[PDB]
Amino acid sequence: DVTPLSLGIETLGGVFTKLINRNTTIPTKKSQVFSTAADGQTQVEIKVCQGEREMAGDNKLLGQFTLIGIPPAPRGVPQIEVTFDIDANGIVHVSAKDKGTGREQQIVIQSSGGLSKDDIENMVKNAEKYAEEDRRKKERVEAVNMAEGIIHDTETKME
Amino acid sequence: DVTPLSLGIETLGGVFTKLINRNTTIPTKKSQVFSTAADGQTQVEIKVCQGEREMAGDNKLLGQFTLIGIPPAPRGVPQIEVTFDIDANGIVHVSAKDKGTGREQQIVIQSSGGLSKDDIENMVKNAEKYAEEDRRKKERVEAVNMAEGIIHDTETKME
């Protein structure tokens, strides 16, 4: 038994960060650490998405939760470990843990909609159709995001 | 009663960071906040320099001291304020204070402690001589300093 479509979460700029590539044998587990997009950010919204598109919004939203109680710290400091657990029954689990505090909340997606073979084929179709339009939109967001970091590193450093 | 030469410290890459520019009317107090160049950096070294060259090593070292006990934190977090307080005589009171922990370390030096007015003009001439060599060195080092930051900000972020 395998994942019909790629799974991931929406990250800064609307980009879809893939965590489990399609046709992965289930059960499966995959982790990645993320951080806050801004200074003083007390929470992070985890939008679990499914599809093959480069931008989250163009994919199916399966579930949504918010990780509460991240102590205010500067942009990019908090270490948020996001883990995708898919059990044998193909039920999606996504936990988010602030490595520092230990604060953690998890979403269990017992039932999302129904995913038809026609829906799957269509999603794979649009992904290939809009591929270079997607690649260019993703590339631009990545530059804006990198520049945001460049503008935020205005302090001189020392050894 | 102005500063004979520019005063400052050594920062990341060996760059000379001015705190008090040349011909600044004294007495005067000037400050700047700096941070660590590496993850989990315990200390910072303050190398008080005098001259007009773009790299600290090519200038006159007036004083050197270490500020220890910076609580381990990622690159760019610790807030180390460096203060240069000059009086009428030319005595510079240099301090390095960790804005967070409150820990302070300080020295006192003589900027008026210069080896002849002939050499103040020699240093000014040494600078104008190596001005293009320096802007080449400075732009190469500053490119590495930026890349170091961009690489330290690779981690994906979330709103």
UniProtKB/Swiss-Prot annotation, chains A, B:
Question: Which positions does the record annotate as the modified residue N6-acetyllysine?
Answer: K129
- What domain of life is recorded for the organism? Eukaryota
Q: Which parts of the sequence carry N6-succinyllysine? A: K129
Q: What is the effect of changing T3A?
A: No effect on interaction with UBXN2A
UniProt subcellular location: Mitochondrion; Nucleus, Nucleolus; Cytoplasm; Mitochondrion matrix
Cite the residue spans of the region called Substrate-binding domain (SBD): 4-159
Annotated region (Interaction with FXN and ISCU), positions in chain = 1-159
Record-listed Omega-N-methylarginine modification sites? R75
Fill in the subunit field for this protein.
Interacts strongly with the intermediate form of FXN and weakly with its mature form. Interacts with HSCB. Associates with the mitochondrial contact site and cristae organizing system (MICOS) complex, composed of at least MICOS10/MIC10, CHCHD3/MIC19, CHCHD6/MIC25, APOOL/MIC27, IMMT/MIC60, APOO/MIC23/MIC26 and QIL1/MIC13. This complex was also known under the names MINOS or MitOS complex. The MICOS complex associates with mitochondrial outer membrane proteins SAMM50, MTX1, MTX2 and DNAJC11, mitochondrial inner membrane protein TMEM11 and with HSPA9.
Domain description: The N-terminal nucleotide binding domain (NBD) is responsible for binding and hydrolyzing ATP. The C-terminal substrate-binding domain (SBD) binds to the client/substrate proteins. The two domains are allosterically coupled so that, when ATP is bound to the NBD, the SBD binds relatively weakly to clients. When ADP is bound in the NBD, a conformational change enhances the affinity of the SBD for client proteins.
Q: Which disease is it linked to?
A: Anemia, sideroblastic, 4: A form of sideroblastic anemia, a bone marrow disorder defined by the presence of pathologic iron deposits in erythroblast mitochondria. Sideroblastic anemia is characterized by anemia of varying severity, hypochromic peripheral erythrocytes, systemic iron overload secondary to chronic ineffective erythropoiesis, and the presence of bone marrow ringed sideroblasts. Sideroblasts are characterized by iron-loaded mitochondria clustered around the nucleus.
Role according to the record: Mitochondrial chaperone that plays a key role in mitochondrial protein import, folding, and assembly. Plays an essential role in the protein quality control system, the correct folding of proteins, the re-folding of misfolded proteins, and the targeting of proteins for subsequent degradation. These processes are achieved through cycles of ATP binding, ATP hydrolysis, and ADP release, mediated by co-chaperones. In mitochondria, it associates with the TIM (translocase of the inner membrane) protein complex to assist in the import and folding of mitochondrial proteins.
Q: Which family does it belong to?
A: Belongs to the heat shock protein 70 family.
User: What protein name applies here?
Assistant: Stress-70 protein, mitochondrial
**Native species:** Homo sapiens
Q: What is the lineage of its organism?
A: Eukaryota, Metazoa, Chordata, Craniata, Vertebrata
Name of encoding gene: HSPA9
> What part of the full protein is here?
439 to 597 of 679
